[PDB]
Amino acid sequence: YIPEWEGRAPDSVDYRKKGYVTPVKNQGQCGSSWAFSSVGALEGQLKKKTGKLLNLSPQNLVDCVSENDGCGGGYMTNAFQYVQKNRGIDSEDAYPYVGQEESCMYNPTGKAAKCRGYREIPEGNEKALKRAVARVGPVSVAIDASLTSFQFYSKGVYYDESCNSDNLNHAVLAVGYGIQKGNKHWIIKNSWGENWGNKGYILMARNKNNACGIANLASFPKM
């Protein structure tokens, strides 16, 4: 067997076709994009591990990941380490999202997935992020989403040269990649509801010198 960091990745990958991606969620006013990005990468690894997939609980992460700040931001790697230490993460149905930080309500009964660690993509290496998406699955990533051009995206492959790759303020999920009208892109799942962008998704420029810092905080959990 030839490992992940070696040889040719396919030119087009989309896990929305293969049942590795849950429907688009809406984080509301709570600044918990790290939680939705974390559960999104955990859902994809749950599908490859068990063959079954299920909507996991970002509220579990908001209320229980003490290393993060609930609605005040957080890192996706701390959520992965939490699930590893906690031995489990609850389902969305058993731990619904309320849009606020509350007390930790984890119960092992509603456990739907586990995690045994994580791996951080080499800093700014878009080729390595591409190989990871093609071989591991959906990868949690952080970007600069403060620009007006990003927030009012609707169609096409998004690119803005003013995007600060050193101000990663929003967490999303790379559910694939490809090419549209001569512009390479990452297929990115956001958490601003289905009515944002293109059905909740945005195609962000790929191989344009790590636009918006797409590969500066990329990671995936291990199951």
Ligand X SMILES: NC(=O)SCC(=O)Nc1ccccc1C(=O)O
Binding site for ligand X (CB under 6 A): 6-9, 11, 126-127, 130-131, 207
Cβ 158 to ligand X shortest distance, Å:
18
The smaller minimum CB distance to ligand X, of residues 135 and 222, is found at 135
Measured between its terminal Cα atoms, the distance across the chain in Å is: 19
The smaller minimum CB distance to ligand X, of residues 47 and 130, is found at 130
Cβ 13 to ligand X shortest distance, Å:
10
What φ, ψ does residue 211 adopt, rounded to 5°?
-60, 135
The smaller minimum CB distance to ligand X, of residues 7 and 51, is found at 7
CA distance linking residue 155 with residue 85, whole number of Å? 41
The smaller minimum CB distance to ligand X, of residues 25 and 131, is found at 131
All residues at 6 or more sequence positions from 212 whose CB lies less than 8 Å from its CB, including other chains: 143, 144, 145, 150, 160, 163, 164, 165, 204
With 0-12 / 13-18 / 19 or more C-beta atoms within 10 angstroms meaning exposed / middle / buried, residue 12 is: exposed
Cβ 221 to ligand X shortest distance, Å:
22
